């Protein structure tokens, strides 16, 4: 695991099965960005599955707002979120960036470089990156 | 033990409660525009419905389980799905305790109902509805927290 920001962690496939660190990190919600992959054995840890493959043609944007709202509520309740995908490089990086934009008032550049600074391999696929820019322009418009 | 029918029930707008059979009624879920399944259990299988986000709230139907700790974060995910124009399915094995408690808390937290009327809506939609005594205690505490 990697702490991206206060109360926000990013991880790869095995992260949800590291039950003892999840309790150490105070993780209370795992966001599992996949269609086929196992939930955390972690007891007492809620898990939200966002069902998309790591492929540019899948619609992640449609899930961003309700997933970020779940994450923020978990943080505001005094817990922390772990966002993870198979590689810990695209899907989970995309959701982490979207979260930082929606609830920590960052731009894509500064949000993604927060993510990249915690997880160097971070690299949302180009379709997700386009959807992240569209997500930002939606956040601009509502302002 | 086969769960009490029907598979799923409308409790209130954009909000359905269900038993084990609910997650296995994929076409009713798509017809109702359910965009979020709330699986209130440790061991029940998620909605075999594809592309629908699923939130597991890991508790047994046991009075010593802390459901209260999950309420605020579960209710906010449900509200976000409702606001985006979809619907939520809250389900537990029997469709009587865990899922009824979460539906009740959701009505209190985001539709401004008291515990009395939130549960009255749940029980009217699902007559067997009965949060176990520990869950009821946690609902009473959640209500007094919401007042303050």
Numbering used by the authors:
A (entry chain B): 19 to 161
B (entry chain A): 12 to 159
Question: Which sentences did the original study use to describe this structure?
Answer:
Dual-specificity phosphatases (DUSPs), which are known to remove a phosphate group from both phosphotyrosine and phosphoserine/threonine, constitute a large subfamily of PTPs. To the authors' surprise, DUSP28 has an only partially exposed active site pocket and exceptionally low phosphatase activity, which together differentiate this protein from other DUSPs.
Collectively, the observed dimeric structure of DUSP28 appears to be a non-physiological crystallographic artifact, and it is presumed that DUSP28 exists as a monomeric form in solution. In our human DUSP28 structure, the predominantly positively charged catalytic site pocket is occupied by a phosphate ion. This anion is stabilized by a number of hydrogen bonds mediated by its oxygen atoms’ interactions with the backbone amides of β5−α3 loop (P-loop) residues including Asn105, Arg107, Ser108, and Arg109, and also by electrostatic interaction with the guanidinium group of Arg109. Therefore, our DUSP28 structure is in the “closed” state (ASC1), like most previously determined DUSP structures, indicating that the composition of the D-loop and P-loop of DUSP28 is well-organized to serve its dephosphorylating activity. Nevertheless, a significant difference between the two structures was observed; the side chains of Asn105 and Arg107 of DUSP28 are bulkier than the corresponding residues Ala410 and Val412 of DUSP10 (top). This situation makes the active pocket of DUSP28 only partially exposed (bottom). One unique structural feature of DUSP28 is the presence of the proline-rich N-terminal extension region (residues 12−18 of DUSP28; A12SPVPPP18) immediately before β1 (left); this unique proline-rich region is absent in homologous DUSP proteins (right). Instead, it appears to play a structural role in sustaining the protein folding through hydrophobic interactions with neighboring residues such as Ala33, Ala34, Pro58, and Leu100 and via a hydrogen bond between its hydroxy group and the main chain carbonyl of Pro56 (top).
